[PDB]
Design a protein around this ligand. Structure first.
Ligand SMILES: CCCCCCCCCCCCOC[C@H]1O[C@H](O[C@H]2O[C@H](CO)[C@@H](O)[C@H](O)[C@H]2O)[C@H](O)[C@@H](O)[C@@H]1O
Ligand SMILES: CCCCCCCCCCCCOC[C@H]1O[C@H](O[C@H]2O[C@H](CO)[C@@H](O)[C@H](O)[C@H]2O)[C@H](O)[C@@H](O)[C@@H]1O
Ligand SMILES: CCCCCCCCCCCCOC[C@H]1O[C@H](O[C@H]2O[C@H](CO)[C@@H](O)[C@H](O)[C@H]2O)[C@H](O)[C@@H](O)[C@@H]1O
Ligand SMILES: CCCCCCCCCCCCOC[C@H]1O[C@H](O[C@H]2O[C@H](CO)[C@@H](O)[C@H](O)[C@H]2O)[C@H](O)[C@@H](O)[C@@H]1O
Ligand SMILES: CCCCCCCCCCCCOC[C@H]1O[C@H](O[C@H]2O[C@H](CO)[C@@H](O)[C@H](O)[C@H]2O)[C@H](O)[C@@H](O)[C@@H]1O
Ligand SMILES: O=C(NC1CCC2(CCCCC2)CC1)c1cc2c(F)cc(F)cc2[nH]1
Ligand SMILES: NC(=O)CN(CC(=O)O)CC(=O)O
Ligand SMILES: NC(=O)CN(CC(=O)O)CC(=O)O
Length: 901
């Protein structure tokens, strides 16, 4: 695999061009934000159905031929004031004139207004039922113009202000368009609730995590930039494919928390790079190379968890998937570009401004408890979660209704009043759409055939008990082509819960010869959508689990840890969905959170499965990979677990808290779908950030310490060669496999190995042949140069340990800093290095910063600054990082002291 090849280059590059990166990407994000403000006028409310289904075809054909039903666009209940009754002919006259005026003013929007009030002397019984028995309320129907849902809704919102002022305001609007206006306005209301309640809370959590103003501010800015760029991208996407309303809040509910968490992790990694003594440029490079990789892998995991949603046919789920993908990918891009560039500019200045600026280890021991006795905690945790799965099996599913809004919502209440006062009018029948393959008309006899065949099916509502009084032809209006080759008949259902059966029965009827039959109606559309979701759930789950487990094996290098992860994520998923059913189907929580218990939107369960699985996988890989890394750390115990939970404890709690703040803003949504999604997010977050991270996954995983890392893998993951003193000096003194003359004109070879000060080259050839034990012809191989160099360092170390000024400082140093001191000795002699009494003593006392600052003041640094700066930063950090990423190549080769023979 390709660990750290491209990320090192990018880490050099962002420091190299921090200014234009921070300019270009900020320009892009702000331009995208401006462009994406227009999103909201280019979003759709459609997307809940299966557009390949037979119900949708029945809808398309029936609307084309009979005209779309616009009778439920807008119902308006009028109550005459001052206890006057609908038969008051003066009140009648004035409201007629008002309605006619608004219609005349809005003929681009209103087809007309229809009702009993238009013919109060009529004898039509259905029209007569448009007034109450007490003569105190009468409703009218106001069909609107337009040829998709969104255009109709916009027309309604255009005419609604003037329509509410009719009858002195004593008019109550209901039907599909007032409800759709309310349901789609919930989006913006949730937006501003997040703006006012979550941004300050994220600010306090950020400042608590960091402690200084700038460090806390950077992730907030990164999140804002991500929000803006992602809204821009979604608008651009809207130019080509339709984008559902619900896609806007998802950008900020899911995306904003992820953006900020990425930012915060990068910033804390940068700060700990600084605290370890690294250059700002080295810091930037190493944070992108370490934490940028895991940020990007998190992005890959979230995208991998989201893309299986694209199997489902609902445009709703597709728009949400696009939004998730756009948000998280931009968040990763921003975190390793804008943020890295900013940090490259600031350097250590990120900690400058402290708490006072006014203008307007606990982990480790808790895990040792679970560790020393695990099963006593694993078992009850593992059974409470299954008895939270038990409510799952009951789940109810249904379509959109007035009850998606809160009970105290005025529009929902106008709908409920209309249904209480005029019960017969709101119907959702099943349609039989008959289409002739040939274009010739359908005869009356063929309709009689289909009519009888339909009569063979039970469970269909029958108002009047008459064979012919059933399955009436659908009404035709002016918008319909009236094509004779297709005719529709319809009838309502007896039991609303008997639809799926009845539809199937209606689909099993052998239709007449030469015709094709599509059965539609709202129950048909809803049930077909549900069938599509239930039918694609297996493949979606399979791809989800297989992709995530493969990613997790890449991350873990084990075949048991990803399987454990998969099943614990499935387990918290089942548990959290059980809780959700407990709250939103059975209602435990309904009174406090102000929502109506009801079935759930069917695409919501696919959305929530993908979302919860993704979150579980993300948090679990972040927690577990730093326990599996403990082999770079070399500690073989199951103590990997304790250090991995302790190293990532504060970080996980901060990230979880920030996302929890954002989702807690959204649990208060007037839209029960949004409530259910935000709540699922919150429940999964608290389940994975506490009960699974802190208690379970130490427990079940101590059941297998050494049996879990790379348990059974043949060839698995290559370990990079550790750097050494040979490579260090090969950089500093060159490695030459043929004799050459150094700056002083002397015959040198290998790594700074003087052969002789003789002018005779063949004297050097003789000496090199003597040293190597063969006639070399003045050429050696790299391994021979390596052995010659090892002999030179053995001589150097002998000399160091015999020197009273160097032996103490040398003995007190680790292997890397010892190699730095030996480097100094090679370059300048024991005596030379021994002149650094102050510096050497600071090194002996592990005062790395003081020693580095003092050594930088030397004439050694002045005459050979690049080599000296490499050695000095090696003394600082105690690592090989200054050599694993150094400046150019050397040009002046000088043989070192302590050349051995
Ligand atoms: C942010 C969340 C917002 C959620 C709020 C949405 C709740 C209100 C929904 C309004 C739906 C109006 O439904 C009434 C219409 O239903 C069908 O047609 C609809 O379904 C067909 C097949 O899909 C499409 O071809 C038609 O274009 C499409 O109008 C009927 O054929 C139309 O005669 C009837 O007028
Ligand atoms: C989730 C949201 C759910 C929303 C549920 C709301 C459902 C509302 C459905 C209301 C439909 C009632 O309107 C039906 C009216 O239309 C037409 O009028 C005609 O009546 C007489 C001749 O029949 C004359 O007065 C006119 O010349 C003529 O126009 C029809 O011929 C009648 O059947 C009926 O009068
Ligand atoms: C960061 C993530 C960004 C992801 C962005 C993905 C945007 C997808 C662009 C197009 C929608 C993809 O889905 C396929 C879509 O094609 C349709 O229209 C098309 O109808 C014919 C069918 O072949 C074409 O020939 C037309 O050219 C074409 O307009 C509609 O658009 C969607 O109802 C439908 O699903
Ligand atoms: C459907 C989605 C379509 C996208 C295309 C699929 C591409 C699949 C992989 C993409 C490569 C992106 O980088 C993935 C890299 O990240 C991982 O992180 C781990 O090493 C990081 C560096 O320290 C830290 O994250 C943690 O150590 C630890 O998590 C590892 O480095 C490697 O597994 C991999 O090299
Ligand atoms: C876990 C870490 C922290 C998690 C939480 C983070 C902060 C989230 C809370 C921010 C505001 C809290 O609620 C404020 C909301 O409630 C009131 O209205 C409604 O309150 C209930 C339904 O919302 C019902 O009483 C009524 O429908 C109606 O009165 C306000 O008027 C709304 O404008 C505001 O939206
Ligand atoms: O917090 C979500 N990851 C966390 C994982 C922990 C981080 C990993 C990188 C270093 C800092 C910690 C970042 C944030 C998260 C995942 C997720 C998902 F897959 C779907 C979804 F809808 C919401 C999600 N949130
Ligand atoms: N680190 C050094 O170069 C020490 N030098 C420089 C100094 O500290 O003044 C003095 C000494 O010879 O002890
Ligand atoms: N030739 C170089 O760039 C390095 N120079 C010295 C330096 O400036 O670091 C020679 C040496 O390593 O002693």
């Amino acid at each position: 695999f390709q660990s750290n090849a491209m990320f090192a280059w990018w880490g050099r590059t962002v420091y190299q061009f921090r200014y234009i990166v921070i300019g270009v990407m900020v320009a892009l994000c702000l331009g995208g934000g401006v462009y994406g403000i227009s999103l909201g006028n280019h979003v759709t409310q459609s997307g809940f159905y299966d557009e390949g289904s037979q119900s949708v075809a029945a809808s398309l054909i029936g609307d084309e031929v009979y005209g779309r039903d616009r009778t439920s666009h807008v119902v308006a209940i009028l109550t005459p004031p001052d206890d006057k009754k609908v038969t008051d002919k003066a009140w009648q006259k004035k409201v007629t004139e008002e309605l006619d005026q608004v219609v005349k003013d809005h003929e681009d929007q209103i087809v007309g207004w229809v009702g009993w009030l238009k013919a109060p002397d009529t004898t039509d019984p259905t029209v007569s039922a448009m007034k109450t028995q007490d003569l105190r309320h009468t409703f009218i129907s106001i069909p609107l113009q337009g040829d998709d849902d969104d255009e109709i809704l916009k027309n309604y919102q255009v005419v609604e202000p003037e329509l509410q002022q009719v009858n002195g305001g004593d008019i109550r609007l209901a039907g599909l368009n007032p409800l759709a206006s309310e349901l789609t306005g919930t989006i913006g209301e949730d937006q501003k609730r997040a703006e006012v309640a979550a941004i300050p809370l994220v600010a306090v959590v950020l400042f608590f995590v960091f402690g200084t103003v700038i460090a806390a501010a950077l992730p907030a800015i990164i999140g804002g930039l991500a929000i803006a760029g992602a809204l821009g991208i979604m608008r651009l996407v809207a130019e080509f494919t339709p984008v559902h309303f619900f896609a806007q809040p998802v950008v900020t509910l899911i995306g904003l928390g992820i953006a900020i968490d990425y930012g915060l992790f990068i910033v804390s990694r940068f700060r700990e790079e600084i605290a370890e003594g690294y250059d700002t440029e080295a810091a930037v490079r190493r944070t992108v190379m370490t934490s940028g990789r895991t940020v990007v892998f998190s992005a890959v995991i979230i995208v991998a968890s989201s893309v299986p949603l694209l199997l489902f046919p609902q445009g709703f789920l597709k728009s949400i998937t696009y939004a998730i993908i756009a948000s998280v990918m931009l968040a990763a891009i921003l975190s390793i570009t804008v943020l890295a560039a900013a940090l490259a500019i600031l350097g250590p200045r990120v900690d400058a401004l402290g708490v006072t600026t006014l203008l307007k280890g606990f982990w480790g021991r808790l895990v040792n408890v679970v560790m020393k006795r695990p099963i006593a905690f694993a078992a009850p945790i593992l059974v409470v979660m299954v008895l939270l799965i038990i409510p799952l099996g009951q789940l109810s599913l249904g379509g959109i209704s007035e009850k998606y809004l809160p009970p105290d919502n005025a529009v929902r209440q106008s709908q409920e009043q209309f249904d209480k006062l005029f019960p017969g009018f709101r119907t959702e029948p099943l349609t039989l759409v008959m289409k002739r393959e040939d274009g010739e008309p359908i005869t009356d006899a063929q309709i009689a055939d289909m009519r009888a065949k339909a009569l063979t099916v039970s469970g269909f509502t029958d108002p009047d008990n008459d064979p012919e009084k059933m399955w009436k032809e659908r009404p035709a209006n002016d918008s319909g082509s009236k094509d004779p080759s297709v005719r529709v008949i319809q009838n309502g259902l007896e039991n609303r819960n008997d639809a799926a059966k009845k539809i199937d029965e209606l689909r099993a009827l052998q239709p007449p010869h030469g015709i094709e039959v599509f059965v539609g109606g709202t129950p048909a559309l809803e049930q077909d959508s549900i069938h599509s979701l239930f039918d694609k759930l297996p493949l979606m789950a399979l791809i989800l689990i297989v992709t995530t487990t493969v990613l997790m094996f890449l991350a873990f290098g084990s075949v048991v840890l990803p399987i454990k992860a998969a099943l614990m994520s499935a387990l918290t998923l089942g548990s959290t969905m059980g809780i959700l059913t407990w709250m939103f189907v059975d209602g435990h929580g309904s009174g406090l959170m102000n929502y109506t218990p009801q079935p759930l939107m069917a695409p919501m369960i696919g959305l929530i499965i993908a979302v919860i699985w993704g979150l579980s996988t993300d948090y679990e890989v972040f927690l577990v990979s730093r326990m599996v890394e403990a082999r770079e750390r070399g500690m073989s115990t199951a103590e990997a677990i304790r250090i991995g939970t302790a190293t990532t404890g504060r970080l996980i709690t901060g990230a979880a808290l920030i996302l929890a703040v954002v989702a807690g803003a959204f649990v208060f949504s007037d839209l029960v779908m949004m409530k259910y999604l935000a709540f699922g997010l919150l429940i999964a977050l608290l389940l994975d950030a506490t009960i699974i991270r802190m208690f379970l996954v130490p427990a079940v995983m101590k059941l297998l310490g050494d049996d879990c890392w790379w348990a059974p893998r043949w060839m698995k993951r290559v370990q990079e060669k550790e750097f050494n003193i040979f490579e260090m000096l090969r950089i500093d003194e060159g490695l030459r496999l043929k004799i050459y003359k150094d700056t002083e004109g002397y015959y040198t070879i290998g790594i700074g190995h003087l052969l002789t000060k003789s002018p005779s080259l063949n004297a050097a050839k003789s000496e090199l042949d003597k040293a190597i034990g063969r006639n070399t012809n003045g050429v050696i191989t790299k391994d021979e140069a390596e052995k010659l160099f090892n002999q030179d360092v053995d001589a150097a170390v002998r000399g160091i340990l015999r020197n009273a000024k160097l032996k103490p400082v040398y003995d007190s140093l680790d292997a890397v800093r010892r190699a730095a001191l030996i480097n100094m000795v090679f370059q300048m002699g024991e005596t030379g290095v021994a002149g650094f009494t102050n510096s050497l003593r600071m090194l002996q006392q592990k005062r790395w910063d003081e020693a580095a600052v003092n050594l930088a003041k030397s004439r050694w640094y002045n005459q050979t600054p690049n080599r000296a700066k490499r050695v000095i930063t090696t003394f600082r950090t105690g690592t090989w990082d200054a050599y694993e990423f150094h400046l150019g190549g050397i040009k002046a080769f000088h043989h070192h002291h302590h050349h051995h023979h």
